[PDB]
Amino acid sequence: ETVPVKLKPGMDGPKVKQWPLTEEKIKALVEICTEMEKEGKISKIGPENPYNTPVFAIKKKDSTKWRKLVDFRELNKRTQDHPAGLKKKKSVTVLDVGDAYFSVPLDEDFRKYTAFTIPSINNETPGIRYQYNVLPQGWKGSPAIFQSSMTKILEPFRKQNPDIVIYQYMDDLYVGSDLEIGQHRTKIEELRQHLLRELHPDKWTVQPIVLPEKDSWTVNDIQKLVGKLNWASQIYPGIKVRQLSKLLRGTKALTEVIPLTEEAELELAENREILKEPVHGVYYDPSKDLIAEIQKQGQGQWTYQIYQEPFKNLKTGKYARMRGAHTNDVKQLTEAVQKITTESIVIWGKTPKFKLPIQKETWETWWTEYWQATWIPEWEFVNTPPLVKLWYQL
Amino acid sequence: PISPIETVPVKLKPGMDGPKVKQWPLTEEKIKALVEICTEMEKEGKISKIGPENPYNTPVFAIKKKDSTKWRKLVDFRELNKRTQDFWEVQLGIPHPAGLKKKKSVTVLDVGDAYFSVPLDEDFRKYTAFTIPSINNETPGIRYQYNVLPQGWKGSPAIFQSSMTKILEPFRKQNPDIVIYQYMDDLYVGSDLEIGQHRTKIEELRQHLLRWGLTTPDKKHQKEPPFLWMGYELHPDKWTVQPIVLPEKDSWTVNDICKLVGKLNWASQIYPGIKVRQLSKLLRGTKALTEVIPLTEEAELELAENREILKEPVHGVYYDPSKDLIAEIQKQGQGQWTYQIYQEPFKNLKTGKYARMRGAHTNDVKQLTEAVQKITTESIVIWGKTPKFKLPIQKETWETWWTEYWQATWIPEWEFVNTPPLVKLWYQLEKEPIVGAETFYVDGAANRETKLGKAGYVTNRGRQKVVTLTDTTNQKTELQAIYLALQDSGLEVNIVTDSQYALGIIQAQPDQSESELVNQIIEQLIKKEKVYLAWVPAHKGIGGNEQVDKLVSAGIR
DNA sequence: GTCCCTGTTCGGGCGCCG
DNA sequence: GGACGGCGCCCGAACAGGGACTG
Ligand SMILES: Cc1cn([C@H]2C=C[C@@H](COP(=O)(O)OP(=O)(O)OP(=O)(O)O)O2)c(=O)[nH]c1=O
Ligand SMILES: [Mg+2]
Ligand SMILES: [Mg+2]
């Protein structure tokens, strides 16, 4: 028996056009949907259902199976409406328990809102439309509705291990412990056996604003430094640029060498210490979105900030692959986005809205060739001013 | 006959009612055509006489078909269409001959009176009420409703496409290795069978369709090459487009231009080198379809080159999945590009053109990256995979740009092709300030009320200049200051600006802009040997920024 | 807030197909 | 002539941001 679910008042369902898929993905989706239909989990529908949500597939790393992935971001936006100790465990593994959802029916009046359309190569046939009969993977309501059965299945494992932390975010179980990695993997297999019925969050580090060290300073150097500190004073009111700026009175050449006074040297060491302290007065508000910004720093380095109001950063970090003879910017940006989403889910149990430093078209052309998660965060695209790139540079 | 398939339930939009619209006057010829069609359809139960219990009506007319003998009955359902529920369209695109694979045997066939074989939902039938006007003074006019899909209703294309997919599903499951391209009711059928066994399978298919109420009249059953399909001619090893006729008018209106541009875009799929930049620019700010625009000389020449290109013979080939897909890109001016997709050297699968202007300011590497993106999603639609590229850009140029550019940008497996015009960066900003180059501190100010402003610079060697401007903006004064520093500097210059607007533009290394003033700047930057551009926060007393700020604020702030 | 400048979306012509 | 849906192209209108102003 089903649980009624409604939409947020005054909101119609999703009407997103399906995007083109490669042959691999189409073949996988067609076989997966065929099986899903033999089992009653989805049903064919026609064009009198006016709703649509895109669909694709990911081939997991060295797994010979594919996984369907519905992009339910709009539907989740439109559907009616956290263990702090998880961020501290020595090791955390992430299980894909979306399968469970196929055991629970879905309120009939809701089913039409989960429509999706398989496309065809070279448009040989019209698209072929389906809708859901059970809890769909990647839908905000699937974990909400299955929560009670989930708690029931987990009660004994949590009793026999109260030192293990289990958290559920939509299609995913996060399991954390303080075990040697062999014993941790053994406990994880215990949990996967019971469910027939590697992260290390304590090593994530903050990337602080950092100032150059020099024995000889030019007008150019000091001008760049004053601009960087002027910017950083909006995050740290301790910062001051009076004396350093005083060194620049007049109209000097950019390469003139400037000797630093005692006052300016003091100011610089003070500012250098102020940037050590953490950002004061920043409290997480759950009823607002996490904003993630990423800046490409070049040579495989990327920097990111998670905040909710401008200059009030909840976290700042970097992702750094090794320098690239055959480096792929879009693949790296996708990896950065998945890593950051993982961290935000673990810490605050919520995904950020990403501002991506890439063209809309480039991203949409390629990002699904590197996606490996079961959720998809919201994003928008920006044309970053290389100033901020210089600001957070390492 | 009428398909025994289940109907598709449909509904009006909430709080809405059926149309009540007067039949208009039709010519006598169309009234005879309609009369014959209607009494025949009535005998077959496709339309039913209605009485005065039905309050609705909507106008009806008729046009000749492709076959100029036969008529086509149409209904202006624009009102009912407004008042009808939404559908999700299921036709996601248009099949393309370059995506077809070589086949031993081929058949093209068409369904007869396709729409009129698919039942319409009973609850909705009353809204389709129409009236055939009196052909006589002595004969009155008959009123009917539809029991099958009518032409002119907004729900018919999708309902028919869906019904056809359902009807063909059993045959496909049973015959997975026979390929049926299904464009509304056109069927291309390909098999790897000898002609006899193939014809037997085609008879199976015809009877399968007939069981579901769809006839395949022999008149449209093509059995020998060349096949006429989707606007093309399909020969056993090559395809072509059915000929393009460009108009030859002497006066040209907007509508004439749109026709010309449309046919050229159609032609570029297999003709290499089509250009529409100038012809298209001709449409800017035009009033309406009737406005006569006179051809520029640039558009004149463009059209001449296109006409020549069209006088040539050209064809495509079919797809071999066991070979790579290769796209080769060629530049033309004005942000225009053509491409050829092929597998063996001089046998194109297809061709195309990319010309879209994205953004106020851009350069040729950006444009090439977006041409690559367009071709990649086109390839995924038509062949389901990404091609290998051959681009007129050196690996060092790409490397440099990808280093210097702050955005994520990427291009799949590719190889340098030495066919000019090569794509290059036309200048490069320094990363460090330049020893021996004079240092300019530039700034602009503008009064938002009167729109008067000043641009100018001071240098570390004592030069000072201020230029006054009328009807300008802050952003524009900043750009003018940079232009001035470039005009008055040597081959090597350090420039310091307070304006992150101007810095963000100039830093992305544009070679084209819709702004004249940015074009003039770009020209200067190409003339230089070394340029270095630093930034400082405005209004903080820093360095030479202060002097020039006080100079340009004088009579404006 | 306002003015500027720049990006995306959508709708309106046309091409082509049925 | 003229009705419908699909994709393509191109242009302009109506938005949505983000940065810099006035006293
Ligand atoms: C060409 C065309 C078509 N249609 C609809 C209706 C029939 C299907 C198929 O078109 P068709 O094969 O040429 O017409 P059809 O009704 O089948 O008549 P015949 O094929 O028997 O001549 O698309 C339409 O609504 N407007 C059009 O202009
Ligand atoms: Mg037909
Ligand atoms: Mg300024």
CSV table of N, CA and C (backbone and C1' of nucleotides) in Angstrom, one decimal, chain B residues 66 183 230-231 262-263 359-361 448 451 473 476 501 505, chain C residues 1-9 13-18:
chain,number,residue,atom,x,y,z
B,66,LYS,N,1.5,16.0,-52.9
B,66,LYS,CA,2.7,15.7,-53.7
B,66,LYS,C,2.3,15.1,-55.1
B,183,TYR,N,9.7,7.2,-40.4
B,183,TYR,CA,9.5,8.6,-40.3
B,183,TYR,C,8.0,8.9,-40.7
B,230,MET,N,12.9,10.8,-47.8
B,230,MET,CA,13.2,11.9,-46.9
B,230,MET,C,13.9,13.1,-47.6
B,231,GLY,N,13.6,13.3,-48.8
B,231,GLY,CA,14.2,14.3,-49.6
B,231,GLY,C,15.5,13.9,-50.4
B,262,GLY,N,17.5,29.5,-46.1
B,262,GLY,CA,17.0,28.1,-45.8
B,262,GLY,C,17.5,27.1,-46.8
B,263,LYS,N,17.4,27.4,-48.1
B,263,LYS,CA,17.8,26.4,-49.0
B,263,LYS,C,19.4,26.2,-49.0
B,359,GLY,N,28.7,35.7,-28.2
B,359,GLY,CA,29.4,36.7,-27.4
B,359,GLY,C,29.8,37.9,-28.1
B,360,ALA,N,29.9,39.0,-27.3
B,360,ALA,CA,30.3,40.3,-27.8
B,360,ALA,C,31.7,40.3,-28.3
B,361,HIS,N,32.6,39.5,-27.7
B,361,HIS,CA,34.0,39.5,-28.0
B,361,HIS,C,34.5,38.0,-28.0
B,448,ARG,N,27.0,59.9,-15.1
B,448,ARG,CA,25.8,59.2,-15.5
B,448,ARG,C,24.7,60.1,-15.9
B,451,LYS,N,26.3,62.2,-19.3
B,451,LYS,CA,27.0,61.3,-20.2
B,451,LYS,C,28.3,61.8,-20.8
B,473,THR,N,30.0,56.1,-21.4
B,473,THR,CA,29.8,55.3,-20.2
B,473,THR,C,31.1,55.1,-19.5
B,476,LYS,N,33.1,52.5,-21.1
B,476,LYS,CA,33.6,53.0,-22.3
B,476,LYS,C,34.8,53.9,-22.1
B,501,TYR,N,36.3,45.0,-15.7
B,501,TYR,CA,35.6,44.9,-17.0
B,501,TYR,C,36.6,44.8,-18.2
B,505,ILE,N,37.9,41.6,-20.6
B,505,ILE,CA,37.8,41.5,-22.1
B,505,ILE,C,39.2,41.3,-22.6
C,1,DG,O5',17.4,47.4,-5.8
C,1,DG,C5',16.3,48.3,-6.2
C,1,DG,C4',16.6,49.8,-6.0
C,1,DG,C3',17.0,50.5,-7.3
C,1,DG,O3',15.9,51.2,-7.8
C,1,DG,C1',18.6,50.9,-5.5
C,2,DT,P,15.6,51.2,-9.4
C,2,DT,O5',16.9,51.9,-10.0
C,2,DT,C5',17.0,53.3,-9.9
C,2,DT,C4',18.1,53.8,-10.8
C,2,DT,C3',18.2,53.1,-12.1
C,2,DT,O3',17.6,53.9,-13.1
C,2,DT,C1',20.3,53.1,-11.1
C,3,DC,P,18.2,54.0,-14.6
C,3,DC,O5',19.6,54.8,-14.4
C,3,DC,C5',20.3,55.3,-15.5
C,3,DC,C4',21.6,54.5,-15.7
C,3,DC,C3',21.7,53.8,-17.1
C,3,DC,O3',22.5,54.6,-17.9
C,3,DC,C1',22.7,52.5,-15.3
C,4,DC,P,23.2,54.0,-19.2
C,4,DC,O5',24.4,53.1,-18.6
C,4,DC,C5',25.5,52.8,-19.4
C,4,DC,C4',26.1,51.5,-19.0
C,4,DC,C3',26.3,50.5,-20.1
C,4,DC,O3',27.7,50.5,-20.4
C,4,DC,C1',25.6,49.5,-18.1
C,5,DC,P,28.1,50.2,-21.9
C,5,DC,O5',28.4,48.6,-21.9
C,5,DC,C5',29.1,48.1,-20.8
C,5,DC,C4',28.9,46.6,-20.6
C,5,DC,C3',28.7,45.8,-21.9
C,5,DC,O3',29.7,44.8,-21.9
C,5,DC,C1',27.1,45.2,-20.3
C,6,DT,P,30.1,44.0,-23.3
C,6,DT,O5',29.6,42.6,-23.0
C,6,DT,C5',29.9,42.0,-21.7
C,6,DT,C4',29.0,40.8,-21.3
C,6,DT,C3',28.6,39.9,-22.5
C,6,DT,O3',29.1,38.6,-22.3
C,6,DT,C1',26.7,40.4,-21.2
C,7,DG,P,29.0,37.5,-23.5
C,7,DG,O5',28.0,36.5,-22.9
C,7,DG,C5',28.2,35.8,-21.7
C,7,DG,C4',26.9,35.2,-21.2
C,7,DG,C3',26.2,34.3,-22.2
C,7,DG,O3',26.2,33.0,-21.7
C,7,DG,C1',24.7,35.9,-21.2
C,8,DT,P,25.7,31.8,-22.6
C,8,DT,O5',24.1,31.7,-22.3
C,8,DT,C5',23.7,31.3,-21.0
C,8,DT,C4',22.2,31.3,-20.9
C,8,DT,C3',21.5,30.4,-21.9
C,8,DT,O3',20.6,29.5,-21.3
C,8,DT,C1',20.6,32.5,-22.0
C,9,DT,P,19.7,28.5,-22.1
C,9,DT,O5',18.3,29.2,-22.4
C,9,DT,C5',17.8,30.0,-21.4
C,9,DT,C4',16.3,30.3,-21.6
C,9,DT,C3',15.6,29.3,-22.5
C,9,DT,O3',14.3,29.2,-22.1
C,9,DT,C1',15.7,31.4,-23.6
C,13,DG,P,5.2,33.7,-37.7
C,13,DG,O5',6.3,34.4,-38.7
C,13,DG,C5',6.7,33.6,-39.9
C,13,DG,C4',7.9,34.2,-40.5
C,13,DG,C3',8.5,33.2,-41.4
C,13,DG,O3',7.9,33.4,-42.7
C,13,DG,C1',10.2,33.9,-39.9
C,14,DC,P,7.3,32.0,-43.4
C,14,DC,O5',8.6,31.3,-44.0
C,14,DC,C5',9.4,32.0,-44.9
C,14,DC,C4',10.8,31.5,-45.0
C,14,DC,C3',10.9,30.0,-45.3
C,14,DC,O3',10.9,29.8,-46.7
C,14,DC,C1',12.2,30.5,-43.4
C,15,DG,P,10.4,28.4,-47.2
C,15,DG,O5',11.6,27.4,-46.9
C,15,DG,C5',12.9,27.6,-47.6
C,15,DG,C4',13.9,26.6,-47.1
C,15,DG,C3',13.5,25.2,-47.3
C,15,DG,O3',13.9,24.7,-48.6
C,15,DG,C1',14.3,25.5,-45.1
C,16,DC,P,12.9,23.7,-49.3
C,16,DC,O5',13.0,22.3,-48.5
C,16,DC,C5',14.2,21.7,-48.4
C,16,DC,C4',14.2,20.6,-47.3
C,16,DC,C3',12.9,19.7,-47.4
C,16,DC,O3',13.1,18.7,-48.3
C,16,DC,C1',13.4,20.3,-45.1
C,17,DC,P,11.8,17.8,-48.9
C,17,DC,O5',11.4,17.0,-47.6
C,17,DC,C5',12.1,15.9,-47.1
C,17,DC,C4',11.4,15.3,-45.9
C,17,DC,C3',10.0,14.9,-46.1
C,17,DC,O3',9.9,13.7,-46.8
C,17,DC,C1',10.3,16.0,-44.0
C,18,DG,P,8.7,13.3,-47.7
C,18,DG,O5',7.8,13.1,-46.4
C,18,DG,C5',7.5,11.8,-45.9
C,18,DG,C4',6.7,11.8,-44.7
C,18,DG,C3',5.2,11.9,-45.0
C,18,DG,C1',5.8,13.6,-43.4
